[PDB]
């Protein structure tokens, strides 16, 4: 069994000043060019990878997991999932949810009701990518009245309202709802030992906790990749259907270029692709209808957008398979986010160290990726720590509390791991604002009004690093 990484002791002695231990300079993340080989027109409308469940045993069939995570399958629709497991979708009906927590916060998007799969400017003159979607907030009781009365009224654009990213995170408030979801097979569960997001150690709302959507026809979630390219799981509660549009991860660079060309931000913007543009650019689009009880698995980095066709609720969360592919794509997006000044809500450094504490990794490729991250960050931490002491800057032991969240720079929003540069919040001597090293130094060249907090004992990190070794299969 061959080790390709230096020991923690060797890393530390390297930082204390001769030869280098690693390059440290790295090709900058960038958006991929159009995939090669190009697809001909007859391959731009592929069928959606599908699983047809009938019995409870079908859902727990092991190859199902591998089918969904297969990188060649950008999305998988699992038909008849609720019925196979005898899930009580009624626990997520609008009626049941309102009775449970009448006053619950619901974030809203107000949108124009667009025809079919198209998106037109407000005057209905031309198709555009910009998707008008304005934010407000209401209660579940009030959105429920709107949805229910809508479903009655039905039976140059109209405005509609969409209850979105409703947080079902509180186990006290949603006990029965959340218990029902423990009936799911491990690979799609909100919490499981094999889900990287269960190793974060703290809540990331909507990723490792459940989010609810309450929809009327036309309610759209515009184009995106998931946060840090994590897989997504979505179950349609019904009674109506949702329509999904999916583009493989490998085309995200092409979509990025479309956004830019239409003066829109790929990562943060609100955009609804013009399918005719995609077709001309030879981008394949998977398109399908999700019925009530059907589960949609969005694979890692898959680009997608969604609209309600009927009146329905959906529930959804992220999961992170323990695979080289998932870890690679999450790290890539983390690095690209840094370059774009976009916050990664999955703190990939914090997470990687927890993975190293908790998980015995037997796949060599995945093992090497994780340990490489540990090496780079351990070196960065020891190097910074040595610089600070060389400057006589004091390092105050701060430690961590159980379940404490990862901290981020209040200025650039980068994750700040281990060594926190903190200065008082304005008009406060109590509350401190976390900064990364660079941002702290641009406010104060010599860190005058800053304190440096240390969250982990270096001896601890060194031990985790050395104890992280390739597991036998």
């Amino acid at each position: 069994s061959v080790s390709i990484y230096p020991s923690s002791a060797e890393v530390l002695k390297a930082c204390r000043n001769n030869s280098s231990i690693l390059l440290d300079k790295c090709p900058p993340p960038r958006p991929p060019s159009s995939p090669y080989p190009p697809l001909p027109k007859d391959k731009l409308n592929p069928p959606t990878p599908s699983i047809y469940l009938e019995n409870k045993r079908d859902a727990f069939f092991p190859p199902l997991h591998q089918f969904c995570t297969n990188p060649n399958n950008p999305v998988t629709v699992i038909r008849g999932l609720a019925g196979a497991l005898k899930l009580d979708l009624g626990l997520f009906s609008t009626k049941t949810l309102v009775e449970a927590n009448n006053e619950h916060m619901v974030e809203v998007r107000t949108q124009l009701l667009q025809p079919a799969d198209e998106n037109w400017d407000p005057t209905g003159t031309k198709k555009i990518w910009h998707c008008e979607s304005n934010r407000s907030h209401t209660t579940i009781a009030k959105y429920a009245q709107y949805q229910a009365s809508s479903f009655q009224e039905s039976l140059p654009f109209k405005t509609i309202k969409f209850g979105t990213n409703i947080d079902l995170s509180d186990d006290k408030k949603w006990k029965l709802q959340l218990h029902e979801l423990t009936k799911l097979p491990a690979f799609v569960r909100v919490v499981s030992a094999g889900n990287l997001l269960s190793h974060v150690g703290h809540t990331i709302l909507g990723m490792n906790t459940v989010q609810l959507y309450m929809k009327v026809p036309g309610s759209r979630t515009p184009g995106h990749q998931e946060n840090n390219n994590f897989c997504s799981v979505n179950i349609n509660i019904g009674p109506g259907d949702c329509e999904w549009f999916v583009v493989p991860e490998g085309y995200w660079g092409v979509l990025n270029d479309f956004c830019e060309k239409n003066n829109l931000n790929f990562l943060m913007g609100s955009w609804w692709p013009n399918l005719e543009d995609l077709y001309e650019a030879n981008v394949p689009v998977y398109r399908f209808i999700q019925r009530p009880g059907d589960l949609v698995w969005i694979n890692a980095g898959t680009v997608h957008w969604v609209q309600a066709i009927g009146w329905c609720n959906n529930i959804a969360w992220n999961v992170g398979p323990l695979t080289a592919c998932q870890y690679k794509l999450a790290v890539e997006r983390y690095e690209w986010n840094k370059l774009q000044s976009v916050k990664s809500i999955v703190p990939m450094v914090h997470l990687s160290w927890n993975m190293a504490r908790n998980i015995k990794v037997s796949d060599p490729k995945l093992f090497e990726m994780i340990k490489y991250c540990l090496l780079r960050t351990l070196k960065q931490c020891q190097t910074l720590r040595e610089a600070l002491i060389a400057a006589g800057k004091e390092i105050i032991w701060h430690g961590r509390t159980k379940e404490e969240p990862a901290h981020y720079c209040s200025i650039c929003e980068v994750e700040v791991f281990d060594l926190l540069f903190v200065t008082n919040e304005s008009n406060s001597r109590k509350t401190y604002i976390v900064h990364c090293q660079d941002c702290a130094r641009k406010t104060s060249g010599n860190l005058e009004n800053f304190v440096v907090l240390e969250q982990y004992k270096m001896e601890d990190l060194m031990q985790v690093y050395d104890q992280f070794t390739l597991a036998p299969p």
């Binding site: 304005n134 934010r135 809540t203 515009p222 943060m268 999955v346 990862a406 903190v422």
Partner: peptide
């Protein structure tokens, strides 16, 4: 022990206004 300002990490949809 110093109290650090924080914001809850959360998945959310784009908004244009």
């Amino acid at each position: 022990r110093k109290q650090l300002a924080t914001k809850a990490a959360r998945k959310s949809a784009p908004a244009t206004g």
